Design a protein around this ligand. Structure first.
Ligand SMILES: CN1CCN(CCCNC(=O)C[C@H](Cc2ccc(F)cc2)NC(=O)[C@@H](Cc2ccc(Cl)cc2Cl)NC(=O)[C@H](N)Cc2ccccc2C#N)CC1
Ligand SMILES: CN1CCN(CCCNC(=O)C[C@H](Cc2ccc(F)cc2)NC(=O)[C@@H](Cc2ccc(Cl)cc2Cl)NC(=O)[C@H](N)Cc2ccccc2C#N)CC1
Lengths: 304, 304
């Protein structure tokens, strides 16, 4: 019993974190086989950051301009190249701790674990969701750039995020590991706004199913509703519209609890219109939308 | 910016998790040097669990009764002994991944990271607080027993918790690594009740300071109050009384934000009496009490 924001164990990623230094700029890199991946803005000075031409900046560097440290042991850089917004530094030593991995790009509404690092040293682990507007509500200070987000599936690490910057609103933006930004952002020190965000409806429903599995039942009711009449109320409260594919994704949770998806939508409808009246659900006074159906199934018991 | 429930990186503990099997009972153990630590109720069958005599049960075992697996590699048990509610299994191989560690017993109100494991395999990491009534509100299914809670301080792992059981209320109870239970509990399958819980006042105040550091200021006010007049309201809302030592613990946060502790108590007083009026603090609609002052300082920037 219980339900917690739960990250993946971080050991497999901790063994890959290095420190990359160029000039007085130091951030984190990801060391897989004989390649180190880090944000390309490590090659910027304070003036370049305002409007950098990265192709120019990189052409003026050489291998010896890049200090890479794995712990205190220095790594010998033998080649450097740019892929979109990530810098790739070839080193002479393949990382002996390289896990089975792949680079995947995630969809808005999906979750991943973040290993926050500073100066190549991991400091904390937490769970994040990619918001519908392609930002993440992380916890990052100056120097955390190059920290990565990942999921783990049977000892394979799927890296999905590398951290680049904090927007003026305090939310966070970054790229996949091919260097392509999530959302309409660029790596330069200018004020950039994310698009308007929305609540991830399917995750809210998954979390209500988690609550039922755990024995939290007060919000249930006998009412059912239709796909289209619920989506009327979703629009009014800035919730994403619900598709039939979302219902099917929620099938296992609906089957395990015996509560049809469109029955749960009626309870969500009522929660949206009347609130909680001082009560909580799984320890929250708000409707939580950063747990996917997969996150619920992974963490919760298989019997209601 | 941002504030998240943040665990310690779990790699150093992942390398210590093994599987211990006795009969048809399998749980997790902690492998440090040439000793495996696990809950002693691994030696119980289904009938013994109701009212076991562990001294009798252990005397009837021998070394070969204990299957220990580190991955798929089997560990050779060469000795077994009981320390309070933990079983110690000496094995012929010292764990090559043994971190610098120590066994510490924590106080109610302190936090730690939990590495949830099943069948010797880590599955997730999350943050917990030891409640004032010596339970923890974890996320544990059957088979998670033997999972451990820890803090990390400069590559030293302080183990503070080993998981034993879930109470009827769904909260969790366990021991320190010397086998001594937190709280008035015993390892037998009987219904046991925790004492009445209370809200950790000093942590709530630390979290309000985290909110100010992050730029969440709506709940502040110009009022101040006294230690004793606030403790009048703490009692009414089932909050722990505030001591002068708690104020001193909060000094650094009070100094960094410029908001005296007894000024923040006035804001907490108002939050307790009027609520939030639809607003949130660091993404919560409730007053959060599972972040210590140390947790805030560790995660938050050093400049407000
Ligand atoms: C309810 N509350 C919520 C919190 N609200 C407060 C939030 C206050 N937030 C800030 O002021 C952050 C600032 C915003 C900004 C952005 C642009 C710009 F022109 C002007 C300003 N952004 C930064 O300074 C950016 C500037 C930058 C540098 C390089 C690149 Cl390629 C791109 C950018 Cl955009 N720097 C970083 O991202 C650091 N690489 C890593 C870093 C540095 C410092 C702090 C965090 C990080 C991280 N992570 C108050 C209400
Ligand atoms: C708002 N919601 C919140 C959630 N509410 C629902 C909560 C429902 N919770 C339960 O029913 C859990 C049950 C309670 C119980 C306890 C005693 C007793 F006599 C009778 C019942 N406890 C167990 O069955 C205990 C029984 C036990 C075995 C060995 C020992 Cl030495 C001590 C004990 Cl006490 N077993 C475990 O602890 C497993 N070792 C590991 C384990 C097994 C199963 C599930 C979880 C875990 C873990 N972790 C509903 C309202």
């Amino acid at each position: 019993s219980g339900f917690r924001k739960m990250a993946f164990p971080s050991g497999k990623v901790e063994g890959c974190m290095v420190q990359v230094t160029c000039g007085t700029t130091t951030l984190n890199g990801l060391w897989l086989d004989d390649v180190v991946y880090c944000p390309r803005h490590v090659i910027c000075t304070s003036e370049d950051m305002l409007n950098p031409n990265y192709e120019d900046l990189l052409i003026r560097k050489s291998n010896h301009n890049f200090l890479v440290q794995a712990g205190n042991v220095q790594l010998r850089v033998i080649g450097h190249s740019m892929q979109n917004c990530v810098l790739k530094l070839k080193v002479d030593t393949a990382n002996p701790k390289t896990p089975k991995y792949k680079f995947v790009r995630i969809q808005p509404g999906q979750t991943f674990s973040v290993l926050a690092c500073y100066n190549g040293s991991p400091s904390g682990v937490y769970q994040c969701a990619m918001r519908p507007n392609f930002t993440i509500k992380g916890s990052f200070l100056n120097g955390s750039c190059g920290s990565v987000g990942f999921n783990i599936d049977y000892d394979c690490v799927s890296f999905c995020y590398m951290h680049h910057m904090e927007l003026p609103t305090g939310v966070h933006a970054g790229t996949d590991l091919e260097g392509n930004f999530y959302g309409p952002f660029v790596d330069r020190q200018t004020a950039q706004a994310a698009g308007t965000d929305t609540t991830i409806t399917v995750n809210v429903l998954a979390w209500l199913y988690a609550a039922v599995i755990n024995g939290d039942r007060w919000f249930l009711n006998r009412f059912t509703t239709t796909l289209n009449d619920f989506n009327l109320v979703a629009m009014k409260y800035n919730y994403e519209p619900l598709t039939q594919d979302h219902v099917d994704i929620l099938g296992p949770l609906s089957a395990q609890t015996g509560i049809a998806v469109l029955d749960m939508c009626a309870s969500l409808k009522e929660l949206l219109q009347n609130g909680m009246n001082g009560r909580t659900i799984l320890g929250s006074a708000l409707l939580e939308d950063e747990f996917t159906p997969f996150d619920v199934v992974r963490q919760c018991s298989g019997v209601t």
